RNA sequence: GGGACAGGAUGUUUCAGUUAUUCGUGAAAACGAAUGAAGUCACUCUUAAAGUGAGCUGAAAUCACUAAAAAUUAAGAUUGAACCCGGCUACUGACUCUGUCAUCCGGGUUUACU
């Protein structure tokens, strides 16, 4: 009836290993389970960054920009000339509005490095920079003051660059006051070469847009082009203002300009000008120096009669726009959630009312709303904010809000104030104690006991969605009384942090922060202490604070102190001297200083104060008001702080990630629960459970690439390592518990002994949350003893007599028990818990407690303890995968849901991985032996769903975990064989996701359709003498191929054909294609069905047809080895020959010729710069070595040029022709500025045809190209394509079985790709290993990739003895199922004519059904 | 961590121009300026014009449908983002701080809407 399922995530990152299953009964059955791994390609295979994609929305952006002002500028210059433009002057107009110069340049290189360090450490070399401002304020100020040409700062930077370069001074002075060389390191190999970089700058073309206006403010007198238009504007000077104040505007404003059907015909609006303009400046967000320059131009443009006459009277200087910040682009929402009287009312309607007003009527309820007159004037949620913005509250009103607050007040009060014993009333597990019937008796008499089952079950529901909210998991209430805030807090604004501040250092009203610059200890200062504070922190992770405990416990022992421990013990004096400067500032006193005293504090106040300067705080005003007064430092504790929803995670790309992770397990999910034949009734219940660790971290690191590879591997390696020493081979156990004697028999014992649980698995069931796979519940302990051991309850008369006299020095058992019941007595629980916070005798004291009586203060103490040792709540990247996860599942089975009637029960559980691996996968690796976790640098992919598995197995956590793993009579290795034996399939299902096909994609826009880069397209001149007619460039026997018949080539070309203008004397005649009407027929012959004459004529077009591209003339240099290219890599033919192949049909013409552009490249090679440089052949390599080649390339062409103009471009790359690969081009029809046709070919960026075309009758032609749909387009022309009627045609994906001829092979086929076919092969893993000569440790260490090397790719198709598999591409085979029968795909090397026959003959059998 | 805005500069391709000229000058020591910029090198053909290729200079175009603007280089099962319009009844932000503006809120999103 009540049906059970689960579903186990390893989520590892790039591998994510799942078990899941569901049953009707509480144990799944061998079938019933399934194993599966998702493979989540990375980055190039699947976007998740936005990166790439932003990059080329504004790449798009500035050509939209300078194609919109341009266009504004010629509708202003030809209404005010009151004619058109001529060609020349708007070339002019153009010249003048190009290269506008910048106006933030904010860097290109990452200053994050430099950004940790104090800006008083480099007032030696930066005497201009002050202590009482951030080092990034001053920085940025300093590199914009030198990209703004600023004089004290470009002499500045100079005389930097001068005095840094005897470095010795300064490695010198550092030191000498207590300065530190690892932090003042950063002074070199970042600021440095951001200096250079600005340095560099200045040549590369950047100038800034006030030496822009100054360059154009010239070369408008000297540009004769522009005379008619400077006559018209009646002025150089105005002319100029007029467009320096058109180029100053952004894409935004043109845009609202143009952003009307009726600016088609580019018409002058005196209004909407004058209106744009003044919309643009106040956009902006003018810096406070910067006022009464935004009044200016505001006043200009606001104030204007006749705008255009304000464009040229306003100076251009004035309207350079401001820097950007969008602060407010999104701001966070706040997660806070809230008891909704919305909610209360439509489930309640009004007794939830009267029940708050019967609680207030009794003295219990007195001061519960202390300050629920100034909170509730703040608006703290969405749905009260939009009940305030149609001015109406039906919900949300002053009354039904201080209900609300006074009842959650109620519910959340802590158990030293709560009068009526709520959450233990309300609890299952109440017992019939004194105190809860007196706790009763205050309830049914304040409330009324009319109505007391239903605030119980009110009472009830709400700390059941409080539980989950707490754990994290707030979504699976699906019917919640509380609502999250959803609406923005306010930024620091500099008033909210000294809220904060006074919040955080108990101070009820804080009124200036002259704390924060408060002397320490000398010249150090409370800000560097807690800035270093925070440091240390964030280094070192959550792991922080048990170092940071253990340093400081050890301290007190006197132990002696690691290289380590002593920082982290110079931390805690460093927080003692902050906490005692903090409380003299501020004359604190009255036990509050203990209360910030630690560094949590104190690198929370370095946040508020110092990170996220322009940031928003947590959650809104009235939630920090009420968690205030649920935390009343002025009082003890009273109510609990409120629930908060889980934030989405930062990293978007993580998101993204995530979010495809949740959707292809819940379509796992959701395939195994319609799989199902359940039907009505028989309620269906989910239960998820994960595991986490760095290694997550590691992957995702490379899934996106994170572009911080090495960085990220070296922070996370320190993380693995330390948990690696947390957990090493278990220490402490076998030198520290054992003590070389076994427990139970008391022999000398070595390395041979093992580790066995001390309480029974089987008492672990009726009674405390788990197995106790901990420190104290486990000893090193001997075969023999642990055969002894049984699984009954244990007790020292089972302890050996010399093992208890070598941990103890007492043999007596009485002695031995009180000794413990003093030891643990003595110890409190933080210390309990923490098994590291003990010395080896408190340890064994604590461990020999467990053997004592049930009866005994110690044992009981222990076993409450760690009973409930933690919540495991979930981590915020577990807290988004589960709630996409439970989203999508919940969606796919919604139709599910609807017809027979299941209804879905989700619950979620956190496994550490900790435990998973280090107890339950060890134990199924002895079983097993295929189980254990190899060490090959790398972790195999199945085994993630052996981690997934062992997830599962360690749901022996019961009494908590619903998912009927229960009853438990059977217990020990009897569980494990129950486990492994019967649960763990063999197969392996390994998902790997991929972006969806372009031929699906009803938003093809969405997929990069083209390459970037343009090719020339070029066509083969036509020579002709007399009689005698030649292919090619010239006369000679290298430049032309010779034409027979050239009559026949002279009537197919007739009409496509244009001869030379300057006719020679006898000087033959060249005849050269014309280029509008050749690419115009080559799209007709693509887009349309044409005649024999025009398939003839393209035929023709084609063959004369040749593509060449410019490559930089540094391609002469392998900069990766610093080495000059060879003649022979340079000049190879493949790079400069042009084949000609006319049939007999078009003349004759065969032949090579040569591209005339090798003879500039021979040029190149064969000059004095680099006649030496360049070897005349690849053997004579050797070690040259030559480091900077591409200085001296350069220095051959930049030529300083002739200052004719100011406003200039720079010359920066210089190429040579180049014949290129072709790979699909495609040739686009656009319009230049003029409005005439120009075509421009591309290179298709994603696949081309579609599939392939079938016939009436079923037959398949392989050779044609069925070009997709989307490039079928009127201006589109696919290269050397034509036009192809297919009203039917087989898909690429179209997979059919084919007739293998074998029984033990099952082999599908799809078309794939224009080429090669793509073969599936279900498989025997056993045969798979006689075919090829591939090796490995069982399937479970398989990779998800197989690399077949030559000799295995010849293996198999020898082994094979099977013609139409064929031989992998490149032998890259995919896996798709893991185990005895493997599943796998791969791209066949080369096409194969029976493999064509096989899938015609399963497609045509498909087709005459 | 990411996301977005603003772009800057150089490339590639298309088209066009250019292989000059006039002055200081009459030495034509080979340079300096002007002509808006460019204006110098090869193969072929020489009739001694030119053809071809490159360079240089200028502009234009640089995903398509597709255009006034936007969306368009992510994903798609779902979405996210972007942009525009209306509003300051109100979450947020900037101001000149009841008064506008917005990256905010609500809505719309393809030739839509104002």
Redesign the pocket.
């Given at each position: 009836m009540t049906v059970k399922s689960t579903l186990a995530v390893d989520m590892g990152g790039r591998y994510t290993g799942i078990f899941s299953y569901t049953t009707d009964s509480g144990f799944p059955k061998a079938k019933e389970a399934r194993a599966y791994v998702l493979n989540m390609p990375d980055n190039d295979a699947?976007?998740?960054?936005?990166?790439?994609?932003?990059?080329?929305?504004?790449?798009?952006?500035?050509?939209?920009?300078?194609?919109?002002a341009?266009?504004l500028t010629y509708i202003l210059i030809e209404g005010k000339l009151k004619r058109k433009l001529s060609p020349?002057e708007?070339?002019?107009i153009?010249?003048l509005?190009?290269?506008?110069?910048?106006?933030?340049?904010?860097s290109?290189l990452d200053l994050?490095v430099l950004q940790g360090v104090e800006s008083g450490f480099f007032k030696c070399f930066l005497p201009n920079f002050d202590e009482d401002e951030n080092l990034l304020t001053q920085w940025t100020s300093l590199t914009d003051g030198y990209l703004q040409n600023n004089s004290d700062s470009r002499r500045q930077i100079q005389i930097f660059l001068e005095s840094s370069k005897d470095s010795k001074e300064f490695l010198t002075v550092v030191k000498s006051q207590h300065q530190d060389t690892k932090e003042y390191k950063n002074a070199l190999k970042v600021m440095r070469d951001d200096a250079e970089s600005m340095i560099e700058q200045s040549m590369?073309?950047?100038?800034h847009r006030r030496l822009?206006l100054e360059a154009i403010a010239q070369?408008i007198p000297?540009?004769?082009?522009l005379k008619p238009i400077i006559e018209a504007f009646s002025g150089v000077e105005k002319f100029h203002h007029f467009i320096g104040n058109l180029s100053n505007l952004?894409?935004?404003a043109l845009?609202?300009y143009?952003?009307?059907?009726s600016?088609?015909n580019n018409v002058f609006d005196k209004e909407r000008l004058k209106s744009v303009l003044v919309?643009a400046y106040?956009?902006?967000?003018?810096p406070?120096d910067l006022?009464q320059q935004?009044?200016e131009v505001?006043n200009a443009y606001e104030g204007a009669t006749d705008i255009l006459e304000t464009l040229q009277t306003l100076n251009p200087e004035l309207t350079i726009?401001p820097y950007?910040?969008?602060?407010?682009?999104?701001?966070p929402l706040d997660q806070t959630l809230w008891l909704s009287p919305r909610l209360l009312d439509q489930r309640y309607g009004d007794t939830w009312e009267i029940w708050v007003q019967n609680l207030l009527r009794s003295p219990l309820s007195k001061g519960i709303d202390e300050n629920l007159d100034t909170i509730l004037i703040?608006?703290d949620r969405?749905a009260?904010?939009?009940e305030?913005?149609?001015?109406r509250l039906i919900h949300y009103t002053s009354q039904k809000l201080y209900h609300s607050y006074v009842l959650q007040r109620l519910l959340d009060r802590t158990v030293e104030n709560d009068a009526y014993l709520l959450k233990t009333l309300v609890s299952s597990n109440r017992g019939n104690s004194n105190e809860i019937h007196q706790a009763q008796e205050r309830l049914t008499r304040d409330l009324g006991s009319q109505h007391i089952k239903k605030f119980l079950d009110f009472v009830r529901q709400y700390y059941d969605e409080v539980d989950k909210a707490k754990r994290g998991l707030w979504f699976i209430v699906e019917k919640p009384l509380m609502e999250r805030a959803d609406?923005?807090?306010?930024?620091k604004?500099d008033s909210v942090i000294l809220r904060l501040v006074g919040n955080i250092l108990c101070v009820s009203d804080l009124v200036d922060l002259s704390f924060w610059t408060r002397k320490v200890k000398g010249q150090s200062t409370v800000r560097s202490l807690c800035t270093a504070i925070e440091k240390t922190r964030k280094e070192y992770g959550n792991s922080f604070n048990y170092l940071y405990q253990r340093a400081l416990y050890l301290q007190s022992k006197g132990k002696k102190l690691s290289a380590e421990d002593k920082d982290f013990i110079k931390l805690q004096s460093n927080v003692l001297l902050v906490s005692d400067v903090i409380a003299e500032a501020l004359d604190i006193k009255e036990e509050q200083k203990k209360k910030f005293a630690n560094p949590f504090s104190l690198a929370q106040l370095y946040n508020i104060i110092e990170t996220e300067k322009s940031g928003?705080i947590s959650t809104?005003?009235a939630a920090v008001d009420e968690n205030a007064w649920r935390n009343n430092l002025q009082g003890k504790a009273r109510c609990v702080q409120l629930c908060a929803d889980t934030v989405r995670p930062?990293?978007?790309?993580?998101?993204?990630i995530l979010?495809?992770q949740a959707?292809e397990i819940?379509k796992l999910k959701a395939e195994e629960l319609l799989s199902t034949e359940l039907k009505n009734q028989t309620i269906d219940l989910v239960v998820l459970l994960e595991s986490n660790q760095f290694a997550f971290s590691a992957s995702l690191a490379e899934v996106?690439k994170?572009?911080?590879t090495a960085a990220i591997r070296q922070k996370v390696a320190k993380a693995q390592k330390r948990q690696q020493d947390r957990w090493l081979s278990k220490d402490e156990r076998i030198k520290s518990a054992s003590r070389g004697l076994c427990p139970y028999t008391g022999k000398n014992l070595g390395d041979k002994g093992e580790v066995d649980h001390i309480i029974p698995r089987s008492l672990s069931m009726n009674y405390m949350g788990s197995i106790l796979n901990s420190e104290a519940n486990l000893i090193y302990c001997s075969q023999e003893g642990n055969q002894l051991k049984l699984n009954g309850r244990k007790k020292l008369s089972d302890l050996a007599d010399n093992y208890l006299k070598v941990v103890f020095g007492t043999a007596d058992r009485g002695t031995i028990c009180k000794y413990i019941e003093k030891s643990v007595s003595e110890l409190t629980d933080a210390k309990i818990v923490q098994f590291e916070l003990l010395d080896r005798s408190q340890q064994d004291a604590v461990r020999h407690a467990l053997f004592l009586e049930d009866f005994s203060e110690a044992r009981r103490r222990i076993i409450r303890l760690l009973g409930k040792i933690n919540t495991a709540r979930v981590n915020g990247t577990q807290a988004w995968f589960a709630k996409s996860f439970i989203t999508?599942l919940r969606?796919?089975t919604k139709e599910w849901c609807a017809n027979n009637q299941i209804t879905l029960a989700f619950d979620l559980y956190r496994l550490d991985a900790q435990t998973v691996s280090q107890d339950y996968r060890k134990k199924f690796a002895l079983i097993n032996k295929d189980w254990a976790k190899p060490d090959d640098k790398k972790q195999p992919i199945a085994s993630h769903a052996i981690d997934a598995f062992c997830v599962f197995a360690a749901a022996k956590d019961k009494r908590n975990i619903a998912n009927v793993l229960g009853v438990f009579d059977e217990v020990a290795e009897e569980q494990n064989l129950k486990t492994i034996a019967q649960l763990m399939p063999s197969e392996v299902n390994l998902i790997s996701?991929?972006?969806?096909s372009i031929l699906?994609?009803?938003?093809?826009?969405?997929?990069?359709?083209?390459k970037?880069?343009?090719?020339?397209?070029?066509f083969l001149?036509i020579?002709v003498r007399g009689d005698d007619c030649r292919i090619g460039?010239?006369?000679?026997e290298s430049?032309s191929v010779k034409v027979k018949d050239a009559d026949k080539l002279f009537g197919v070309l007739d009409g496509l054909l244009k001869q030379?203008?300057?006719?020679?004397?006898?000087?033959?005649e060249?005849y050269?294609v014309d280029?509008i009407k050749a690419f115009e027929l080559l799209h007709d012959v693509f887009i349309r069905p044409c005649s024999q004459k025009m398939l003839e004529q393209a035929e023709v077009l084609e063959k004369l047809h040749y593509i060449?591209?410019?490559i930089?003339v540094t391609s002469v240099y392998d900069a990766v080895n610093r080495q000059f290219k060879c003649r022979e890599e340079i000049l190879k033919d493949k790079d400069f020959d042009i084949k000609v192949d006319l049939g007999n049909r078009f003349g004759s013409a065969k032949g090579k010729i040569t591209?005339?552009?090798k003879?500039?490249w021979e040029?190149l090679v064969n000059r004095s710069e680099l006649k030496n440089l360049i070897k005349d052949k690849l053997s004579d390599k050797g070690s040259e070595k030559t480091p900077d080649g591409e200085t001296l390339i350069y220095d051959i062409?930049r030529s300083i040029?002739?200052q004719?103009?100011s406003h200039?471009?720079?010359?920066?790359?210089?190429?040579?022709?180049k014949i290129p690969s072709i790979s699909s081009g495609v040739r686009?029809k656009?319009?230049?500025?003029n409005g005439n046709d120009?075509?421009?070919?591309?290179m298709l960026?994603d696949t081309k045809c579609k599939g392939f075309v079938v016939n009436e009758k079923g037959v398949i032609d392989w050779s044609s190209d069925l070009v997709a749909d989307?490039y079928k387009?009127?201006?589109?022309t696919i290269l050397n394509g034509r036009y192809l009627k297919a009203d039917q045609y087989v898909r690429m994906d179209q997979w059919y079985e084919v007739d293998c001829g074998r029984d033990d092979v099952i082999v599908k086929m799809c078309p794939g790709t224009s080429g090669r076919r793509y073969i599936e092969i279900t498989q025997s893993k056993k045969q798979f290993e006689d075919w090829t000569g591939y090796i490995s440790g069982s399937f479970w260490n398989y990779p998800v990739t197989i690399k077949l090397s030559s000799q295995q790719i010849a293996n198999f198709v020898k082994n094979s003895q099977m013609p139409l598999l064929g031989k992998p591409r490149s032998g890259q085979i995919t896996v798709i199922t893991l185990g005895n029968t493997l599943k796998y795909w791969y791209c066949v090397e080369s096409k194969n004519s029976m493999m064509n026959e096989a899938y015609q003959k399963a497609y045509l059998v498909h087709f005459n059904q």
């Open positions: 699947l976007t998740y960054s936005m990166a790439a994609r932003t990059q080329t929305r504004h790449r798009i952006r500035s050509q939209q920009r300078f194609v919109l341009r266009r020349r708007k070339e002019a153009s010249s509005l190009r290269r506008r110069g910048y106006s933030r340049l904010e290109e994050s590369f073309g950047h100038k822009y070369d000297r540009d004769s082009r952004q894409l935004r845009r609202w143009f952003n009307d059907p600016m088609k919309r106040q956009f902006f967000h003018y406070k006022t935004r009044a505001l726009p950007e910040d969008q602060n407010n682009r999104r701001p703040t608006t969405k009260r904010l939009l305030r913005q149609s001015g609406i923005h807090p306010p930024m604004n928003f809104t005003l930062f990293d978007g790309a993580l998101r993204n979010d495809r959707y819940a996106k994170s572009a911080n999508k969606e796919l996701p991929k972006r969806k699906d994609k009803n938003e093809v826009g969405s997929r990069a359709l083209m970037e880069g343009i090719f020339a397209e070029h001149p020579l460039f010239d006369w000679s430049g030379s203008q300057k006719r020679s004397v006898n000087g033959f060249t050269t280029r060449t591209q410019n930089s591209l005339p552009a003879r500039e040029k062409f040029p002739v004719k103009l200039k471009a720079t010359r920066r790359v210089w190429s040579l022709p686009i656009r319009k230049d500025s120009i075509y421009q070919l591309y960026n989307l387009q009127p201006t589109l």
